[PDB]
Structure formats: C-alpha cells, structure tokens
C-alpha cells in the first residue's frame, strides 16, 4: 500500500517522488523526514478529535463578517420533512429542538447531539449564533429562498471522522575566487557581484575584469569584499550577474553564505544561472535546474580555517515622536540611540528600528536582537509588514510568525494568497512560515484545500517546483483521505483540458452548433462522465459538483474558448444547480488577486455596517495558464442587454432605456425598487473598487448584471493603471440610479454618499492594502513589479492626507467623472 500512496502523491503534485531522491541533497532529505513527522503527528491528533471538533476541522463555519423566516428540515435517513417558522434571532439548537419534537409526534416518540447540514453541501450550522449570522441563512433572506436543512446525528459525523483515517574571530575582508563559466553570446563579458541582506547592500558591488565574449570563460580572480567576515549576518546573500558590454544582461544567480546548518560555506561551487529579463537580490537562492542548457559559473569560497553562526545565548550575551509616524541620517541615529525607549514605549515601531540597524556590523545586530528577544508581540497588521523582504533576518521572521499565530482562520484565509507568495522569499526549505502554513492547513481542511491549489498551480515554474513539491508531499502525508479527494479534482481537470483542446480544434473547422454537439458526445463517454461527476469544487470545497448536465454545457466563443460546465444535484435542489468555467490559455493570477481584494473591501465595508451588495465569485488558478471561474447564474452582460433586441420584454424606444426595461422585466411591480437599490449599491462598490485598484478598460462587455439588480465585473487583466485611470461614471448606470428620470438628485446624491462612505472606509485600512500588495511583489505578476505600482495605491487612497482633504480630492474626481458622463 505504501507504494500505492507514493504514486498517488506523485500524480497529484505533478512531480515524481523519485526526482526528490535523485537530487541526493541533505537539506531536501531533512526537510522531507522532519515534515513527514510533523504532518503525521497532526493527522494523529485529528483522528481522536471530538465530533464537534471534527466538524470544526472539516466544515468550518461560514459566518457573516426580531423577524421570522420559513425553513425546511429533515433527518438524514428519511424523505418526509417539515417546514417550520422561526426567527432570524433563534439559535440552531432552538431549531433542532423543533425538528426533534416534530419527529417525536409523527414517529410516535436531545438537541445537543446534532448538527444541521445545508442540503447538498459540505456546510453546517452549529454553535451559539443567531441564524442570520450564518452566511447561508443570510443569502437565503436576500435572494428570498427557504433554507433547506438536514439533521445530522453525532454518530454519523463520527463515522465520517473514522473513514478518513490515514565566527567573531575572522577579521580579514570576505572574498571569493571567480574561476570560469560556460555561456552563449555576442563584445566583452563582465561579472558583477554584490552582498545583500534583503534590499540593502552590505557594502559596494565589486566587479570583474572584462574578458572577450569567447568561451566557456576563465577568470581565476580573488574578488575581495568591503566588510569583515565576522560581520556577515546569519542571512547574508551573495549575488552574481553576468552580462556583456562594448548593455546586455544575460544571467544572474544568488546563494546564501551560510548553509541551512548555520555553517559558513567553502570551498568551490558551480552556479547554474537563470537567464536575464543587472543584480537580483530577491531572486531565488537556488540554482537553475535545467543544468543541460543553463550557463554556469564556478566560484570558490575560501575555507577560513567548521564555523557556525554562534548560538542565541552567545548572541544574548553580547523630536522622536514627531518623525515617528524614509528618514535622514541623524534621524536614524536618534532612533537607534533610543532603541530601548522604542521597545518600551513604541513597540509598534519595530520595523522602523530594524530598517535603521546596521546589518553590516555584528555588534549592532547583536544589540538589536537582544531587544527583539523581549519585544512584546505585535498586532496582526504589523506582523504582515515584517514578512516583507526588507526583513530577511530569521529571528525577525520568527517573531513575525509568532505575532501571526493569533490570526483567525477567516483572516488566515483572507491573506493566504500573500503568505504563499512569501514562501518565494524564503532562503531555506525548512522554515517557520512553512511549518506554520502546514500546521494551520492540517488543522483546517478549507485552508488545506486552498494551500494545495496555490501550490499545485505553480508546479510548472522551475524556480518554485521543488519547494512547493515538497510542501504538497508533506501535506499528503498528513491527510491520506484529502489527498484522494484532491486527486478526484485533478482527474476532472485533466479531462476538462482534453475536452477544451478538442473544442479549440473543432471550432476552427466547423460551426458552433456542430462543435457543441461533438463536445456533448465526448462528454458522454463513460470515462468523462465518471471523471467530471461527483467532486468537491476546486473553487469552494463546500460546493459539491454532483452530476454534470451535458445538455447544458457549452463553450464561450472568445479566443481561448472557455468551457461552460453545469452541474445539478437532487439532494441539494436549486442550490445544487451550479456552474464552473474552465479556461486554458490565459494567466488567471491577476483576476484572482483583483477578486480577492474586492472581497476584502466587501469585508471591511460590512464590518462598519455597509453592504454594497457585491458578488464575490470564485476564481482559482490550477495549473499552467489554467484555472476555473465560478459561474454567476441568472446574469447577462450590459452589452448583451444593450443589443436592444426585438421580441423581448425589454424592447425600448430609446437605447438608454434598455437596461432599465430589462430590470423591470425581471422585477415586476413592487420588486422594481429593491432592484434599483441593489444596482445602486453595487454600482458604488464597483466604481470605488475599480478606481482604487486602477482597473481600466471597463466597458459593456466585461460588466454584468444579475436579475436581482446587482452589477459586477468580469475579465480584469489590467490594474494599478497599467494600460492614472479616472473615476468612471457611466451614463447608462446613472440613468438606472435616477430611476429613468433626467433629473433626480435625491437618488443620485444618495449614490454619491455610498461611494464616499466606501472610499473613506478603505482609507482607514490603507495600510492593510499596502502591506498586502507589498508581499504580492513576490509573485512576479507583470503589473506588480516595482515601487511605482505600490505608489499607484498610495495615490488612489490619498493616504498622505487628512480625511477632510482626501474627500475633497475624491469629490473633484467624482465630479469630473459625472461631467465626462455624456
């Protein structure tokens, strides 16, 4: 069996386990064994959790950031069900108490023994919460639907649990011998080398003597660095660049001066280089794996004697306020001088003190660490700052995770994307972040689900394949059962790719009707019906994709020919009718970031009691230019509606009336007002979110509207201005906001209020967005590459002003936008 599991892992993670062995690398070997231990311990802990704790692990509650309602309840075993009236304020237990009482009378005759499942879903209602605190009981009230629930007994939950069981001495200046290379080019070659600790240089960047573009070059020259070897910090990083000149970059390579055992490196090394876009401190510190093709640089770290970075005990032995909220030399000096006072009175300024310490003087790093070692824990917001690449020291990183353990699962979920990207900054495979992420993921299956996909979706990238591969293996060691559940997803995704390639070929030779019919036959093959049915959705594991409806599936006719896949479930009813889009050919990372940030805005808004009726649909990259998007049903494009077709309810005398007629048609009589209100609110949310994010090229093809009135956006691939994008008011939306009237400043100005509140709320969390984008720079998105991009956000949230100023600023733009509107 142990053989079976390995091969399943290999298939799942998209890398063969044998490839790990062949590298014959101790670090990899240790990472693997230690982490397998850690993960297997976790699994053990799980298989003895109480039933409530199990539910908590497997189906984490989905909560919102008096009045009565109808709900239908039934028991696991039988068909008969009852429809109760209850209050939105009632606890789940109160509801369970009705159900049981009701069963006792029909079935001729203890609430605490149960949980309530959402019909056809991996979702449960339990805990001390009023019903309307539950996202599903909420959803129900807005959409109008009668919540449908099943009483699940503790012994059934336990059956699920069961089935799923598995030194100071050296003062001479540092130096390296540059021996030779083996590259391809046109001119003379030079090597530039600099020592880094994060973004900062630890001294000037000494270069090579130029040699002709010949070879296979040979240098054999001592490069000697402007710093003492007892002054190299633990996380010292040596960076090379090779280029040509009479300016043409060619390749770069980085390495840690200390191995993962704190021992300083000697003697010789071969560096397999990464091709170039001169110096790249943030670039991975591991060599290019394509050792066949890569230009390669041999160098020699002189054996200065075994020398280790000294133990912590050894380390442990050895106008303020006004500026304190970039700083001049003396200012920095004042800070450093006052470090105990910083510690004692402004612990929240840790980062600023870290950026002023002299990482190229061991004494000062010792002093700093001593302070860091008694430093009170920080708020989550400050911890997120400390994970930035500007803080490469592992004791800093350690403290940072320490301050992050207090993250809730919901918060952790909210920042998971960024945390995974941060793994790219990591210098060694065995690290605090990795242990932290793995531990939270083994303790929460939703976390586990999305961690997996964030990693899996990056396997095609040589620079992260090893790291992420190893993380996924460890995870799998920790959850045998979930591994199988994930394979079932991978199998579905394998078949969709096949089906999608077919469709792309077919549609170049034939009509859409024909291709669709072919897709359907393909899908109807046993192997596909089986692969595509009965899975957890990669977009949301709590969504069950049961039987695929072939007749409903189709494809979209835009370039990559995205696949449109519908599903249904008898057990879930209406809520079982769900759809996924498969797209192969585009980079989806962008859209996912944009969507996650809008989701974040919606959360912050709802936390101050503003519900802008947002539509935070799923988007999940899964593979190389491959991923899924969640289908929003009952929606159509503005453009499509604006086609103003004959023979439809929405037929208008004037095109400006089209969108409003459509809304009328879907929302007759008294319903109309609420729709117009949903439109207004969501419009405000999207106008603010796009303005803040610098998302341009919005137009009627990529804006959609739901039959409730809710407006939302699809296909963002441009943001942070990457064409200063102006605030956008669209006449046709304005016309819908003003209830079809040429003049209606009551409605229009309410609408201005909404935008203004939304914009002001976001400013109060501007630092959160800043910190989050900062970490994203680790992802390599072409529209998130440098400071000018973060600067875009700075400018959009006018974070450098008082609230009064920024609002005045905003107002001018908003006004300017209206003027632009016809």
> CB of residue 635 vs ligand ZZM: minimum separation in angstroms?
5
762 binds ligand ZZM (CB under 6 A): no
Phi, psi of 607 (to 5 degrees): -65, -20
Member of 635, 642, 661, 730 binding ligand ZZM (CB under 6 A): 635
> CB of residue 559 vs ligand ZZM: minimum separation in angstroms?
10
DSSP label at residue 216: S
617 binds ligand ZZM (CB under 6 A): yes
Interface with ligand ZZM by CB under 6 A: which range of 58-66, 275-283, 624-632, 756-764?
A: 624-632
Burial letters 323-351, b for 16+ CB under 10 A, else e: ebeeeeeebbebbbebbeebbeebeebbb
> CB of residue 205 vs ligand ZZM: minimum separation in angstroms?
42
Member of 223, 387, 422, 631 binding ligand ZZM (CB under 6 A): 631
> CB of residue 116 vs ligand ZZM: minimum separation in angstroms?
29
> CB of residue 581 vs ligand ZZM: minimum separation in angstroms?
6
The answer to whether 548 touches 529, Cβ cutoff 8 Å, is: yes
Pairing relationship of beta strands 619-623 and 703-706 according to DSSP bridges: unpaired
* Burial (CB count within 10 angstroms: exposed 0-12, middle 13-18, buried 19+), residue 742: exposed
Residue span 715-754 as binding mask against ligand ZZM, x where in contact by CB under 6 A, dash where not = x---------------------------------------
* Burial (CB count within 10 angstroms: exposed 0-12, middle 13-18, buried 19+), residue 291: exposed
Q: Which two tokens stand for residue 419?
A: 């945390």
Q: Where in 32-91 is the site for ligand ZZM (CB under 6 A)?
A: none
Nearest to 423 by CA among 438, 445, 413, 410: 438
Partners of 193 in the beta sheet?
240
Q: Which two tokens stand for residue 576?
A: 């079982």
Q: Which is nearer to ligand ZZM, 396 or 631 (CB)?
A: 631
Q: Which is nearer to ligand ZZM, 701 or 756 (CB)?
A: 701
Q: Where in 117-146 is the site for ligand ZZM (CB under 6 A)?
A: none
The answer to whether the bond into 640 is cis (omega within 30° of 0) is: no
> CB of residue 704 vs ligand ZZM: minimum separation in angstroms?
6
> Alpha helices of 338-463 — where are they, by DSSP H?
339-345, 350-354, 362-372, 380-386, 394-404, 409-422, 432-443, 445-456
Question: What distance in Å separates the CA atoms of residue 629 and residue 592, rounded to the nearest whole number?
Answer: 9
Residue 264's SS3 state is: strand
Q: Which is nearer to ligand ZZM, 366 or 560 (CB)?
A: 560
Q: Where in 693-722 is the site for ligand ZZM (CB under 6 A)?
A: 714-715
Q: Where in 419-448 is the site for ligand ZZM (CB under 6 A)?
A: none
CB atoms within 10 A of CB 64: 14
Q: Which is nearer to ligand ZZM, 150 or 635 (CB)?
A: 635
> CB of residue 556 vs ligand ZZM: minimum separation in angstroms?
6
628 binds ligand ZZM (CB under 6 A): no
Nearest to 360 by CA among 226, 552, 460: 226
> CB of residue 629 vs ligand ZZM: minimum separation in angstroms?
4
Burial letters 369-395, b for 16+ CB under 10 A, else e: bbbbeebeebebebbbbbbbbbbbbbb
Member of 231, 393, 540, 591 binding ligand ZZM (CB under 6 A): 591
CA-angle at 383, arms to 378 and 385, nearest 5°: 130
Q: Which is nearer to ligand ZZM, 420 or 628 (CB)?
A: 628
Question: What distance in Å separates the CA atoms of residue 681 and residue 670, rounded to the nearest whole number?
Answer: 18
Q: Which is nearer to ligand ZZM, 58 or 615 (CB)?
A: 615
> CB of residue 54 vs ligand ZZM: minimum separation in angstroms?
34
**438 alpha carbon, distance to own chain's centre:** 16
637 binds ligand ZZM (CB under 6 A): yes
Member of 178, 378, 396, 619 binding ligand ZZM (CB under 6 A): 619
792 binds ligand ZZM (CB under 6 A): no
Interface with ligand ZZM by CB under 6 A: which range of 266-274, 390-398, 631-639, 692-700?
A: 631-639
The answer to whether 272 touches 294, Cβ cutoff 8 Å, is: yes
> CB of residue 583 vs ligand ZZM: minimum separation in angstroms?
6
Interface with ligand ZZM by CB under 6 A: which range of 2-10, 90-98, 627-635, 749-757?
A: 627-635
> CB of residue 695 vs ligand ZZM: minimum separation in angstroms?
13
> CB of residue 416 vs ligand ZZM: minimum separation in angstroms?
19
Interface with ligand ZZM by CB under 6 A: which range of 189-197, 629-637, 676-684, 788-796?
A: 629-637
Interface with ligand ZZM by CB under 6 A: which range of 88-96, 173-181, 496-504, 625-633?
A: 625-633
The answer to whether 389 touches 779, Cβ cutoff 8 Å, is: no
Go through the chain and list every residue after which a break occurs, taking a C to next N gap over 2.5 angstroms, comma-separated.
65, 109, 166, 186, 246, 277, 305, 318, 325, 723
Q: Which is nearer to ligand ZZM, 231 or 630 (CB)?
A: 630
Q: Which is nearer to ligand ZZM, 307 or 593 (CB)?
A: 593
602 binds ligand ZZM (CB under 6 A): no
Q: Which is nearer to ligand ZZM, 409 or 715 (CB)?
A: 715
**Residue written as tokens 């069950």?**
544
Q: Which is nearer to ligand ZZM, 96 or 566 (CB)?
A: 566
Nearest residue to ligand ZZM on Cβ basis:
632
Q: Which is nearer to ligand ZZM, 151 or 595 (CB)?
A: 595
Pairing relationship of beta strands 68-75 and 148-153 according to DSSP bridges: parallel
Interface with ligand ZZM by CB under 6 A: which range of 213-221, 420-428, 530-538, 630-638?
A: 630-638
DSSP label at residue 230: G
> CB of residue 627 vs ligand ZZM: minimum separation in angstroms?
9
Pairing relationship of beta strands 124-125 and 148-153 according to DSSP bridges: unpaired
Member of 369, 578, 629, 729 binding ligand ZZM (CB under 6 A): 629
Q: Where in 561-590 is the site for ligand ZZM (CB under 6 A)?
A: 581, 583
Question: What distance in Å separates the CA atoms of residue 711 and residue 649, rounded to the nearest whole number?
Answer: 20
Interface with ligand ZZM by CB under 6 A: which range of 201-209, 345-353, 439-447, 628-636?
A: 628-636
Give the binding-site size for ligand ZZM (rule: CB under 6 A). Answer: 12
The answer to whether 722 touches 650, Cβ cutoff 8 Å, is: no
Question: What distance in Å separates the CA atoms of residue 527 and residue 538, rounded to the nearest whole number?
Answer: 20
Interface with ligand ZZM by CB under 6 A: which range of 103-111, 232-240, 541-549, 626-634?
A: 626-634
**Residue written as tokens 């909210």?**
414
> CB of residue 62 vs ligand ZZM: minimum separation in angstroms?
21
Half-sphere exposure of 743 (CA within 13 A, CB side): 0
DSSP string over 509-540: TS-HHHHHHHHHHHHHSHHHHHHHSSEEETTE
632 binds ligand ZZM (CB under 6 A): yes
* Burial (CB count within 10 angstroms: exposed 0-12, middle 13-18, buried 19+), residue 415: buried
Residues that bind ligand ZZM (CB under 6 A): 581, 583, 591, 617, 619, 629, 631-632, 635, 637, 714-715
């Amino acid at each position: 069996v142990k053989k079976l599991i390995n091969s399943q892992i290999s298939l799942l993670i998209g890398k063969g386990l044998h490839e790990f062995d062949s590298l014959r690398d101790p670090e990899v070997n240790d990472f693997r064994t230690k982490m397998r231990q850690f993960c297997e311990e976790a699994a053990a802990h799980r298989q003895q959790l109480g039933w409530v704790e199990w539910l908590q692990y497997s189906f984490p509650l989905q909560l919102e950031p008096n009045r009565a309602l109808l709900v239908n309840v039934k028991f696991e075993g039988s068909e008969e069900s009852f429809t109760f009236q209850v209050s939105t304020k009632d606890m789940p237990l109160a509801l369970m108490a009705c159900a049981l009482r009701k069963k006792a009378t029909v079935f001729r005759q203890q609430p605490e023994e149960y949980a309530l499942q959402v019909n056809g879903r991996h979702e449960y209602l339990y805990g001390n919460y009023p019903l309307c605190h539950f996202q599903y009981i909420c959803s129900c009230l807005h959409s109008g639907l009668t919540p449908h629930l099943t009483m699940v007994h503790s012994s059934s939950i336990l059956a699920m649990r069961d089935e799923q069981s598995n030194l100071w001495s050296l003062e001479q200046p540092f130096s390296i011998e540059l021996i030779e290379g083996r590259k391809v080019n046109a001119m003379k070659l030079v090597v530039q080398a600099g020592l880094f600790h994060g973004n900062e240089m630890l001294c000037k960047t000494v270069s090579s003597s130029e040699v002709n573009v010949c070879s296979e070059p040979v240098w054999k020259q001592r490069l000697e660095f402007d710093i003492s070897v007892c002054d190299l910090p633990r996380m010292a990083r040596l960076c090379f660049a090779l280029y040509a000149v009479v300016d043409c970059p060619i390749a770069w390579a980085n390495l840690m001066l200390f191995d993962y055992k704190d021992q300083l490196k000697t003697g010789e090394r071969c560096l397999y280089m990464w091709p170039s876009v001169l110096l790249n401190p943030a670039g991975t510190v591991r060599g290019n794996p394509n050792t066949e093709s890569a230009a390669a640089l041999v160098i020699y770290l002189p054996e200065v004697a075994p020398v280790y970075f000294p133990a912590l005990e050894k380390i442990l032995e050895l106008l303020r306020e006004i500026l304190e909220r970039e700083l001049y030399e003396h200012e920095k000096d004042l800070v450093w001088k006052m470090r105990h006072e910083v510690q004692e009175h402004f612990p929240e300024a840790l980062a600023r003190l870290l950026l002023v310490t002299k990482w190229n003087k061991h004494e000062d790093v010792a002093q700093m660490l001593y302070l860091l070692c008694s430093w009170p824990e920080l708020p989550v917001l400050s911890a997120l700052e400390l994970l930035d690449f500007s803080f490469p020291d592992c004791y800093v990183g350690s403290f940072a995770i320490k301050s992050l353990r207090k993250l809730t699962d919901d918060e952790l979920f909210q920042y998971l994307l960024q945390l995974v990207q941060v793994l790219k900054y990591e210098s060694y495979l065995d690290c605090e972040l990795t242990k932290f992420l793995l531990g939270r993921a083994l303790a929460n299956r939703k976390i586990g689900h999305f961690l997996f996909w964030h990693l899996r979706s990056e396997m095609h990238v040589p620079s992260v394949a090893l790291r992420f591969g190893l993380i996924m293996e460890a995870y799998c060691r920790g959850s045998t059962h979930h591994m199988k559940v994930l394979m079932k997803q991978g199998e579905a995704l394998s078949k969709l790719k096949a089906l999608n390639d077919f469709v792309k070929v077919s549609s170049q030779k034939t009509t859409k009707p024909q291709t669709k019919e072919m897709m359907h036959m393909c899908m109807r093959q046993e192997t596909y019906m089986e692969a595509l049915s009965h899975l957890q959705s990669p977009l949301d594991p709590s969504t069950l994709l049961e039987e695929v409806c072939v007749e409903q599936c189709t494809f979209m006719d835009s370039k990559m020919k995205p696949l449109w896949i519908m599903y249904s479930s008898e057990e879930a009813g209406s809520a079982g009718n769900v759809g996924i889009i498969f797209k192969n050919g585009d980079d989806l990372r962008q859209d996912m970031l944009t969507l996650q940030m809008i989701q974040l805005m919606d959360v912050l808004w709802k936390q101050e009691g503003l519900d802008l009726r947002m539509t935070p649909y799923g988007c999940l990259p899964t593979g190389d230019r491959t991923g899924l998007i969640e289908v929003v049903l009952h929606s159509d494009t503005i453009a499509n509606i604006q086609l103003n077709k004959s023979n439809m309810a929405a037929t208008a005398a004037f095109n400006k009336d089209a969108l409003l007629n459509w809304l009328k048609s879907k929302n007759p009589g008294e319903a109309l007002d609420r729709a117009i209100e949903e439109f207004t609110l969501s419009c405000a949310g999207y106008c603010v979110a796009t303005y803040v994010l610098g998302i341009g090229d919005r137009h009627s093809d990529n804006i959609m509207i739901r039959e409730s009135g809710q407006l939302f956006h699809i296909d963002f691939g441009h943001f942070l201005g990457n064409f200063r994008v102006p605030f956008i008011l669209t006449y046709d939306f304005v016309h819908v906001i003003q209830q079809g009237k040429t003049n209606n400043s009551e409605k229009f100005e309410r609408f201005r209020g909404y935008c203004e509140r939304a914009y002001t709320i976001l400013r109060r969390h501007g630092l959160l967005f800043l910190h989050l984008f900062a970490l994203m720079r680790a992802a390599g998105l072409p529209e998130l590459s440098c400071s000018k991009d973060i600067q875009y956000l700075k400018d959009s949230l006018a974070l450098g002003k008082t609230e009064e100023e920024a609002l005045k600023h905003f107002r001018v733009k908003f006004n300017e936008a209206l003027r632009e509107s016809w």
